[model samples]
Target: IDCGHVDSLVRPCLSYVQGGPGPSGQCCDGVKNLHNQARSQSDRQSACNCLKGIARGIHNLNEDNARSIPPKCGVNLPYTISLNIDCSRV
Candidate 1:
């Protein structure tokens, strides 16, 4: 995922990364590795969706933390109990 330095094999390195998801896929290459090429439609959509989930979850935690007394439910508790709960329940 190293960037800033222009490698001699830059184009081939990028082509290899953009080929598809696998062992040395986009995620494994680190953030900088995906830099400009992540503009592709499918990559953009997936990245946006993933960031949205992180933002939403962080917002939820912020809202909960703003409470004076604090929440009784531990962060880990929800996932542990959710093992038996369906996605619809969430």
Candidate 2:
């Protein structure tokens, strides 16, 4: 959807992506919530960009944790989870 909604979903993932044992159920739900929100290519593009910003906003994000967060939460992202992920490809 928009950056604000994307930002909300990303926040739920923070604990796990930053070194918590695992994502909370709420966090997992958030990921799916994000996945479900993008129903069209244009929205997906916007989502990717917003999600990238929201994700990178966190400092000290663990690489392994960030990369694994989606899978661990039971979904896959079109883009790799990284602070530097460029949204142009999405």
Candidate 3:
């Protein structure tokens, strides 16, 4: 999927990023779906860059919680979920 699709996929997790109670089932599903859909290396890199941009834009984002999203959702990304991450390496 493309960046636009990635946006839609991760949009449900906005509450988690904004320091909400925690990620909901929907949020976790979206994360997993994104992982499943981004099949190729290029697609994964694009998703990484997209998420990094999103994380950067959110204020009061809990970096630790954000990092836990993948494991919490049973989604293993090739890249670490961090704004400082090099998406090119994904």
Highest-scoring model, lDDT: 3
lDDT, candidate 3, 1-90, per-residue tens = 467887766666666656677667776777787777766787878787677777777667676766666677777655543575675656
- Global lDDT of each model? 0.28, 0.66, 0.69
Give the poorly placed runs of model 3, Cα more than 4 Å off.
79-81
The lDDT ranking, best first, is 3, 2, 1
Report the number of backbone clashes for model 1: 0
Instruction: Give the clashing residue pairs of candidate 2, or none.
Output: none
- Residue pairs with clashing backbones, model 1: none
What are the runs in model 2 whose C-alpha is more than 4 Å off?
Answer: none
Per-prediction TM-score to the true structure, in the order listed: 0.30, 0.72, 0.76
Error of 1 at 37 (Å): 3.4
What would the per-residue lDDT of candidate 2 be over residues 1-90, giving only the tens digit for each residue?
Answer: 456676666666666677876667776687787777767776667767765766566666677876777777577766434655655555
Q: What's the distance in Å from true for residue 31, model 1?
A: 2.0
Model 3 lowest lDDT segment of ten: 76-85
